[PDB]
Amino acid sequence: TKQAPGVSIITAEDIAKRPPSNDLSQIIRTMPGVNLTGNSSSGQRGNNRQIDIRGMGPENTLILVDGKPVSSRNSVRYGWRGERDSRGDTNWVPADQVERIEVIRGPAAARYGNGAAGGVVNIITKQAGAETHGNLSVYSNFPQHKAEGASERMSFGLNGPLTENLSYRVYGNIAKTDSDDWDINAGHESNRTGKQAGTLPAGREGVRNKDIDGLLSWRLTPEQTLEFEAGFSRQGNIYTGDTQNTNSNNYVKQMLGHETNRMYRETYSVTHRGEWDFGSSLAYLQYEKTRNSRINEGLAGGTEGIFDPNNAGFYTATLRDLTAHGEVNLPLHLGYEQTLTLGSEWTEQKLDDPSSNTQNTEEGGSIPGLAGKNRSSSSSARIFSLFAEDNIELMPGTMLTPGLRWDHHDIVGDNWSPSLNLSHALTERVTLKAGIARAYKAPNLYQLNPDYLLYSRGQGCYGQSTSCYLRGNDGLKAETSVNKELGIEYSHDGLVAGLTYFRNDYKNKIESGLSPVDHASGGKGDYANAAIYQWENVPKAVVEGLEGTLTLPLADGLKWSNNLTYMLQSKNKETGDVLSVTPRYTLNSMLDWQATDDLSLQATVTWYGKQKPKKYDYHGDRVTGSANDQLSPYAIAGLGGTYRLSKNLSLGAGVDNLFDKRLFRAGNAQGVVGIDGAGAATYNEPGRTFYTSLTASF
Ligand SMILES: O=C(N[C@H]1COC(=O)[C@@H](NC(=O)c2cccc(O)c2O)COC(=O)[C@@H](NC(=O)c2cccc(O)c2O)COC1=O)c1cccc(O)c1O
Ligand SMILES: [Fe+3]
Numbered sequence: 001t002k003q004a005p006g007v008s009i010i011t012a013e014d015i016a017k018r019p020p021s022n023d024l025s026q027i028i029r030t031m032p033g034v035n036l037t038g039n040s041s042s043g044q045r046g047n048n049r050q051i052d053i054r055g056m057g058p059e060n061t062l063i064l065v066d067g068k069p070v071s072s073r074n075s076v077r078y079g080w081r082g083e084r085d086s087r088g089d090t091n092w093v094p095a096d097q098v099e100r101i102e103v104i105r106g107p108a109a110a111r112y113g114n115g116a117a118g119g120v121v122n123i124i125t126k127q128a129g130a131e132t133h134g135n136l137s138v139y140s141n142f143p144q145h146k147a148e149g150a151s152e153r154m155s156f157g158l159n160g161p162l163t164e165n166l167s168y169r170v171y172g173n174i175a176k177t178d179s180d181d182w183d184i185n186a187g188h189e190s191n192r193t194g195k196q197a198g199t200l201p202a203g204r205e206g207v208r209n210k211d212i213d214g215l216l217s218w219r220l221t222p223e224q225t226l227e228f229e230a231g232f233s234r235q236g237n238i239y240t241g242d243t244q245n246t247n248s249n250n251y252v253k254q255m256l257g258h259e260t261n262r263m264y265r266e267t268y269s270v271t272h273r274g275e276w277d278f279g280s281s282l283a284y285l286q287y288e289k290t291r292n293s294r295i296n297e298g299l300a301g302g303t304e305g306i307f308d309p310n311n312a313g314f315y316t317a318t319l320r321d322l323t324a325h326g327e328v329n330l331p332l333h334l335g336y337e338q339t340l341t342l343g344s345e346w347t348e349q350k351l352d353d354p355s356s357n358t359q360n361t362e363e364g365g366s367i368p369g370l371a372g373k374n375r376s377s378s379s380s381a382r383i384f385s386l387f388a389e390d391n392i393e394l395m396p397g398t399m400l401t402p403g404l405r406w407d408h409h410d411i412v413g414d415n416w417s418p419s420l421n422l423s424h425a426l427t428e429r430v431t432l433k434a435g436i437a438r439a440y441k442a443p444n445l446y447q448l449n450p451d452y453l454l455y456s457r458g459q460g461c462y463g464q465s466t467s468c469y470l471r472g473n474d475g476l477k478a479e480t481s482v483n484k485e486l487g488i489e490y491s492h493d494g495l496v497a498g499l500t501y502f503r504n505d506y507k508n509k510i511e512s513g514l515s516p517v518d519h520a521s522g523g524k525g526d527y528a529n530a531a532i533y534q535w536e537n538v539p540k541a542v543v544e545g546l547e548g549t550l551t552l553p554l555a556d557g558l559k560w561s562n563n564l565t566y567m568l569q570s571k572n573k574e575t576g577d578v579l580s581v582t583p584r585y586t587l588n589s590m591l592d593w594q595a596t597d598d599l600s601l602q603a604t605v606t607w608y609g610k611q612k613p614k615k616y617d618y619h620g621d622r623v624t625g626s627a628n629d630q631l632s633p634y635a636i637a638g639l640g641g642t643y644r645l646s647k648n649l650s651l652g653a654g655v656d657n658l659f660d661k662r663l664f665r666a667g668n669a670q671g672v673v674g675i676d677g678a679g680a681a682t683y684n685e686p687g688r689t690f691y692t693s694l695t696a697s698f
Contacts, residue, residue, distance in 0.1 A: 001489075001491055001496050001551075002014070003031075003032065003489075003496060003498065003551075003563065004433075004498075005431075005433040005485070005488070005489055005498060005500045006033075006104065006105050006106055006107070006108045006433065006485055006487065006500065006502075006547075007102070007103065007104055007105070007108065008031035008032060008033075008034075008102075008563075009100055009101070009103075010027055010101040010103075011100050012098065012099055012100060014027065015027060015095050015096070015098055016642060016652065016693075016695070017590075017592070017600065017602045017640065017642065018030070018590075018602065018604065018638075018640070019095065019139055019640075019652060019654075019691060019693055021141055021151035021177060021691075022091060022095075022153060022175050022177045022207065022209070023087065023088075023090055023091040023177075024090045024091065024093070024095060024098070024101065024123065025049075025050065025051050025088065025090045025091075027101075028090060028101060028103065028121055030563060030588040030606070031103045032105075032500075032547035032548065032563045032564060032565055033053055033054050033103075033105045033106075033119070033500075033502070033547045033565055034051060034052065034053055034565065035051075035052040035055065035565065035567075035580070035582045035583070035586065036049040036050070036051065036052065037049055037050070037052040037055075037057070037058065037580045037582055038050075038058075038083055038580070038581070038682075039057045039058055039059050039082045039083050039084075040057070040081050040083065040511070040579065041577065041578055041579070041580065041581050041613065041614035041669060042081035042083060042614075042668055042669060042670075043613070043667070043668040043669035043670075044079065044083045044244050044245070044305070044668055045083045045084070045086075045242065045244065046665055046682030046683050047180075047202065047203060047204045047205065047242065047683050047684055048083075048085065048087055048242075049683060050073075050086075050089075050090070051088065051090055051121060052118065053105050053106075053118035053119035053121075054105055054106060054118055054119070054483075054502055054504060054545060055543040055545065055567055055570045055579060055580050055582050056118030056481065056506070056543060056579075057118065057579065058118075059082075059115065059441075059444070060116070060117040060118035060119075060439075060441060060479075060481075061115075061120075061121060062109075062112055062114075062115045062116045062119070062121070063089040063090060063121050063123070064121070065093055065122075065123050065125065065267075066122075066123075066124060066125055067122060067284070068267070068269055068284060068286045068323065069286070069288075069321070069323055069347075070089040070092060070265075070288070071288055071290070071319065071321040071349065072089050072263060072290040072292075072319065073086040073088055073089050074290075074319055074321070074349065074351070074444060074445065075263070075290040075291075075292035075317050075318070075319035075351070075353075076292055076317070077297070077305075077317075077353070077356045077446065078444050078447065079244060079304060079305060079454075080304060080454050080456075080460060080470055080512050081512070081618075082511065085242070085244075085261070085294075085297075087205065087235070087237075090121070090123070091207065091209065091235065092211065092231075092233050092265060093123050093125065093211070094137075094155040094171070094173035094175065094211055095137075095139075095153070095155075096135065096137030096139075096153075096155045096695065097126055097135075097137075097155055097157045097171040097173070097213075098123055098124065098125065098126070099124045099125060099126045099127070100124045101121065101122065101123050101124065102122040102124065103120070103121050104116075104119050104120040104122075105118070105485075105502070105547070106435065106437070106483040106484075106502050106504065107419060107420075107421060107435030107436055107483045107484070107485055108421055108437075109437075109439065109483075110405070110417055110419045110437030110438065110439040110440070110483060111389060111419055113345065113383075113387070113405050113407055113440050114347075114383055114385075114440050114441065114442045115440075115441060115442070116439055116440070117439035117441050117479065117480075117483070117506075125169070125171075125213070126157055126159070126169065126171075127159065127167075127169055127215075127217075128159035128161070128167040128169045128217065129160070130161070132158075132159065132161070132698075133157075133159055133698060134156065134157055134158035134159065134160075134697065134698055135155075135156065135157045135696065135697040136154075136155075136156050136695070136696045137154070137155045137156075137157075137693070137694070137695045138153065138694045138695075139151070139152070139153040139652075139691065139692075139693045140152050140691065140692055141656075141689050141690065141691040141692075142690040142691070143686060143688070143689045144660060144687050144688035144689065144690075145662070145687045145688075146181070147180055147181040147183070147184040147203070148180055148204075148684075148686045148689070149177055149178030149180055149203075149206050149238075150177075150178050151175070151176070151177045151178070152175065152176055153173070153174075154173070154174050154175070155171060155172065155173035155174075155175075155211075156171060156172055157169070157170070157171040158170050158171070165219050165220060166216065166217070167216070167217040167219075168214070168215060168216050168217070169213075169215045169217075170212075170213065170214045170215070172211065172212045172213075173209055173211040173212075174209065174210060175207075175208070175209040176207070176208050176209070177204075177206050177207050178206045178238065179203065179204065179205055179206035179237075179238040179239070179240035179257070180202070180203020180204045180240055180684060181203065181240070182200070182202070182203075182240050182241045182256045183200070184203035184684065185200055185203060185664050185665050185666070185684070186200060188664035188665075188666055188681075189201055189667060189678075190626055190667040190676040190677060190678045191626065191676040192674060192675050192676070193674050194674040195674050196247060196673075196674030196675045197674070198248070199246055199248050199674075200241055200246070200248070201246045201665040201666060201667040201668075201678065202241040202242035202243075202246075202665065203240050203665065203684045204684055204686075205238065205239065205240060205242060206238030207235050207237055208234075208235065208236045208238070208259075209233065209234070209235055210234040211231075211232075211233045212231070212232045212233075213229060213230070213231045213232075214230055215227060215228070215229035216228050216229070223274060223276045224272070224274060225272065225273035225274070226270075226271075226272050226273075227269070227270070227271040227272075228268075228269070228270055229267070229268070229269050230267065230268045230269075231265070231266065231267035231268075231269075232264075232265075233263075233265040233266075234262065234263070234264050234265075235262070235265075236259040236261070236262040236263075237259060237260060237261045237262075238257065238258075238259070239255045239256060239257065239258055239259070239260040240256065240257075241253075241256060243306040243307075244297075244304050244305025245302050245304070245305070245672060245675065246667045246668060247306060247675065248306075249306060249307070249309055250309065251295075251306075251307040251308075251309040251312065252306065252307055255295065255307065260294060260295045260307070261292070261293065261294035261295070262291075262293045262294070263290060263291070263292055264291040264293075265288070265289075265290050266288070266289045267286060267288050267289075268287050269284060269285065269286045269287075270284065270285040271283070271284040271285075272284075278330065279328060279329045279330045279331055279339075280328070280329035281327070281328050281329075282325075282326075283324070283326040283327070284323070284324065285323070285324050286321075286322075286323040286324075287320070287321075287322055288319070288320075288321040288322075288323070289319070289320050289321075290318070290319040291316050291317075291318055292316065292317040292318075292319070293314050293316040294314060294315070295307045295308075295312075295313070295314060296308045296311040296312070296313065296314075296315055296355055297355075299356070299358065299359040299453070299454055299455065300359060300363075300454070300455040300456065300457075301456040301459060302459070302672065304454060315354050315355040316354070317351070317352065317353040317354070317355065317356070318350075318352040318353075319349070319350070319351055319352075320348075320349075320350040321347070321348070321349050321350075322346075322350075323345075323346070324345070324347075325343070325344070325345050326343055326344045327341055327342070327343040328341065328342050328343075329341050336392050336393065336394055337392075337393040338390055338391055338392040338393060339390075339391040340388065340389070340390050340391075341387075341388065341389035341390075341403075342387075342388050343385075343386070343387045343388070343389075344384075344385065344386055345383070345384075345386075345387075346382070346383075346384055347382065347383050348380065348381075348382050349379075349380060349381050349445060351378070351379040351380070351445045352377050352378060353377055353379070354377045356446065356452055357375040357377060357449070357451040357452055358373075358375070359453040359454060360372045360373055361469075361520060361522075361523070362523065362524070363457075363467070363523050363527050363530075364455055364467045364468070364469055364520050364527055364528070364529075364530030365520035365521045365522035365523035365528050365529050365530055366520055366521060367453075367469060367471070367518075367520050367532060368521075369450070370450065370451065370453065370471070375451040375453075376451055379446075379449050380445070381409060381410060381411060381445060381448065382410045383407050383408065383410075384408040385405065385406070385407045385408075386406050387403060387404060387406070388404055389401065389402075389403040390402050390403070396425075397425025397428075397431075398422075398424050398425065399421075399423045400420070400421075400422050401419075401420070401421040401422075402418075402419065402420050403418070403419045403420075404416075404417075404418050404419075405417040405418075405419070405440070407440060407442075409442055409478065411448060412442060412443065412448075412476060412477065412478050415440050415480070416438070417437065417438050417439060417440045417480075418437070419435075419436075419437035419438070420435065420436055421433070421435040421437075422434045428492075429491060429492040430488065430489070430490050431488070431489050431491070432487070432488050433486075433487045433489070433500075434485070434487075435483075435484070435485045436482065436483070436485075437482070437483050438480050438481065438483075439480065439481045440478060440479075440480060441478055441479030441480070441481075443476045443478065443479075443510050443535070446472065447472060447473065447476060447510050447535040448472055448473070448535075449472035449474070450471060450472045450474055451472065452471070452472035453469060453470070454469070454470040455467070455468075455469055455470075455530070456468055456470075456618075457527055459618065459672060459673065460618045461531065461533075461618070461619070462513070462514045462515075462533065462618065462619065462620050463514060463515070463619065463620050464516075464531065464619070465619075466530065466531055467523070467526075467528075467531070468516065468530050468531040468532070468533055469520060469530055469531070469532045469533065470513070470533050470534070471533070471534050471535075472534070472535060473534035473535045473536070475534075476510055476535060476537060477508045477537045478508065479506070479507065479509050479510055480507045480508060481504045481505065481506045481507065482504070482505040483502070483503075483504045484502065484503045484504070484505070485501065485502040485503075486501050487499065487500030487501065487547070488500075489549075493553070494551060494553045495551065495552060495553065496549055496551035497550050498548065498549045498550075499546065499547075499548045500546065500547040500548070501546055502543075502544070502545060503542065503543070503544045504542070504544075505542060506540070506541035506542060506543065506579075507539070507540065508538065508539070509537070509538040509541050509572070509579070510535050510536070510537060510538075511535070511536060511538050511572075512535065512536075513533035513534050513535065514533075514536070514574070514575075515533070516531035517532055517533065518531075518532040519531055519532060538572060538573075538574050539573070539574060540574070541571060541572050541573055541574075542569055542570075542571050542573060543567075543569060543570050543579065544567075544568040544570075545565065545566050545567040545569070546564070546566040546568065547563075547564065547565060548562075548563070548566075549562065549563050550562045554591075557594040557595065558591070558592070558593050558594070559590075559591075559592040560589075560590075560592075561589070561592065562587060562588065562589050562590075563586075563588045564585065565582075565585060565586040566584070566585040566609075567582045567583070567585070570582065575616060575620065577614045577615055577616045578612070578614055578615075581611055581612070581613060581614070581669075581680055581682070582611070583608040583609040583610070583611050584609030584610045584611070585607070585608075585609035586606065586607070586608055586609065587605075587606070587607040588604065588605075588606050589604060589605045590602060590603070590604050591603040591604075598643065598644045599641065599642075599643050599644075600641060601640075601641045602638075602639070602640045602654070603637070603638070603639050604637065604638045604640075605635055605636070605637045605638075606635065606636045607633065607635045608631075608633060608634055608635070608636075609633050610630055610631065610632065610633055611630060611631040611680040612630050612680060613627065613628065613629070613630070613669045613670075613677075613679040613680045614669055614670070617670045618670070623670050623671065623677060624671070625671065625676060626671075626677055626678065626679060627669065627670045627671050627676070627677030627678075627679055629666070629677075629678065629679030629680060629681055630679060631663065634661050634663070634685075635661065636657050636685070637657070637658040638654060638655055638656045639654050639658065640652065640653065641653060641654060642693075648696060648698065649694070649696050650694070650695045651693065651694055652691075652692065652693035652695075653691070653692045653693070654690075654691055655689065655690055655691075656686070656688070656689040656691065657685075657686065657687055657688050657689060658688065659688075660687045660688040661685065661687075662686070662687045663681065663683065663684065663685035664681070664684060665678070665681065665682055665683055665684050666678030666679075666681040666682075667682070668682065669682060
């Protein structure tokens, strides 16, 4: 099956029948338990949605490529409201060079440690064979409405032997997703008056991709395999007016249609793989270096996340992330039959950001212990990690899997993440699974850094109108979550029916504080002696919901598949406001007809439930008027097909959003002065879009 309780596989064949425009989030998000959301509820950078597992937000979704972490979005400034102006980290690997994607949700993911509190998405690449194989894949879409950006994608792959004991695989991708027109949301925007008259909430940012990977696999002995690979990728955007608060100035407009951020991502990796009689071994060294080059933004109030015209030009933030990992697997023949796994992990995150720590104290007054100018650019954290997995077969069909993970964070201190996963054959066709683990979240280098400083004259200050500073806090605790799940699944002859309940009890969620810890001294007029808030640990939050799957073989050539997410609860237990904004439910429905030996046909529908905005503004006061707007449930239908011309050539064609259901970003969720809120109307849903594809392969 592609769906067990807590786990989902997406295969290469699924990627081909529901082709993504560009980014994989498009297909990853259709798995049970998975949403495409912002990190908190501000709606800021709302067209920049990323993969969320069980409403735990996308910072708690760990992205791997071939078992190796991607950390590149940790190069983008983390803002007051817990969003980054980032497209996330699911668009580094081109769709057509993916072998399969593994999604692991909740208690079975806690064993991966830091930032798997929601789950793990592991994007697996196609590898060399015993002979030389390769492909050339091209995709091109055509929106009905010209405003919305079309997507074009060309990727090759090429793998094979060199000697009997030397293998290689290489691929290369070139792609572009045109931005939405600067004016797509015109006539849909929230009410904008005074200074903010004429402002617009932006459509989807465009991106240009360039990806190149080379891998050499070397098995210098029957038991011993040694892999070296390098990765070079480059994303440059196409700017279409997006700003944190949806305000505008002249620099913004100058940059419509230009590259305003470029991410270069370089990965080198050494991997040694061992199989002998005692069992199985694996250890890797990955060096990920991310350069985030983008136009300087302001760091104060309504100027937070708008191009700063007084400091025009590009800065470059540099993220050097170092990962080494060791694991063994030992089969044991004991009172109960079992398999033991022993592992260390070492990581280093160096962040050089020459822009983020430049907010000065001339207006709100100075902060004892914080220099007002020329503060360090530098942040780092090392985690050391030890873990052991025991995979115990009590009686055939039954597995009990206890694991202990211990992590030493060189600032925050010690974390203990224990876990237990039970799976039970009640019948040869029915299987019960229960799991309770405590997952782990290290504060990001922005939250942690006493040199990282935002400012507001009041409009963004919790429980007051006065000027206030928000400050990094190296005193922070790690976020932990006791992810519980109880689930049942019938599976027999491609008939699959399953339903899982999950509850994550969420401790110490890090977030902009609610009480001043202190007050600065000096500064200008009514702004002087501003209040000082830090990044605080929220004592308690809860997420809760249901994951379902149902697969029926209607006839031999014909398969009816369904995945269900239903989000029961998502609650900051301090304020009572929501954590994320998700659709109440999500049903993805595919009919797959194998019409001929050669012709396959696919109809899909996605139903999205209601979406409700946050109840409280930045003050902690109740929002009013269009800040309360909700999005009604809506559905998106699509047809496609793939006509195989030969062993060497396949063609695809179809239509996303058959009935042209469209939604428009009205702005952020709450009111500010001159910019009415837009409630849950914070993203653009594209209309009818034709697409065609071609895959040539030996
Ligand atoms: O969305 C927010 N702004 C909007 C809406 O707010 C406004 O337009 C006005 N605004 C206040 O009246 C305000 C009254 C009482 C208190 C205020 O803070 C006001 O700003 C004027 O500010 C501005 O025109 C600009 N603003 C600064 O230059 C600034 C410079 C330094 C420091 C600032 O705070 C600045 O606003 C841009 O502000 C905006 O576009 C917004 C969000 C989050 C937090 C904010 O503070 C926001 O203001
Ligand atoms: Fe302000």
